[PDB]
Amino acid sequence: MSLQGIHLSDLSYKHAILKESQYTIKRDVGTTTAVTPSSLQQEITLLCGEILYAKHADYKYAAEIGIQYISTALGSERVQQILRNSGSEVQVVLTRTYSLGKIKNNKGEDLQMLDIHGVEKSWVEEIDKEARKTMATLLKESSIPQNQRPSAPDTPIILLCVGALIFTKLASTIEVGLETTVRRANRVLSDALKRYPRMDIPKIARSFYDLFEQKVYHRSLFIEYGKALGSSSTGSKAESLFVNIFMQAYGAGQTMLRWGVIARSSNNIMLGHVSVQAELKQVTEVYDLVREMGPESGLLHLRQSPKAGLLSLANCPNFASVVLGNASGLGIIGMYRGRVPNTELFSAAESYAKSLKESNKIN
């Protein structure tokens, strides 16, 4: 008599299928990666500074240096456990300090350089040589505070701030990622650009994007470092900047859910349209899935987890059209490339949203 038993609940079943599995994928079985022990933190910070204040021929492994500092901050065994828990069988290789050779430093000891697996030495000595030449040139020209030196403790966090700026747009295109990273770091990293006026933001951002694309476990390492930093009691200013950029990447890849919440908050009329009303059930199911996954549902597209895609709203064309129209009416949509299934609904929602934004009311 009543159509109350006609009910499927496909999305809950799909989530149950995916989560309730007793088998674990073993990927990257034959590969290896590099970590740096925490006891070398100082001598990585220096290198994190030498990539900054100098103009270098090639910035290939700046991202690997930022990840090495992350390793020192978390520790070797913690980093190994983080990589193992992300689903990778990659085996970490320990960074080793090594005497350069006949080169002798001011302190009378042999100059100890870094040996990072996968990053060849020659690049390291090239970066160090270029930084030393630049610093000698600047001292010759004029006579350098403590905060304009490579030994400054906030240089690794500035490198990781460029890394986090590219991390924010990991669900985006490489060109848009680089453009947004540079155009934000010209404002976000203004102090560091005053202290280090010749640090190359485009190449560092490109290196970080390449690293995040290839070594997908380093996304999980980055997220664990952000969680460790945000749970600290104290920090520097650059560390709080890094945590701000990191938390500005939370809902990455899922702006449709956010704009749907916005459209609900804006009381759009076309949400009550009959084509839309046929679809509120699966939309509520998607948001219920978000609630069920909990706080980790936001880092799905950053981690690049295959489970991301259950949160997609691509099967609600009326809802997506209304949401995109409401976002466009309020000026939110910007240069968003999301497809509009129903152009008529989009235009109507845009018109109503603009009419509401122009008008004002007292409640």
């Binding site: 080169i103 040589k129 030449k133 000698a136 030196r149």
Partner: peptide, 7 residues
């Protein structure tokens, strides 16, 4: 003298 710098 390059490697003799303060750093």
């Amino acid at each position: 003298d390059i490697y003799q710098l303060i750093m």
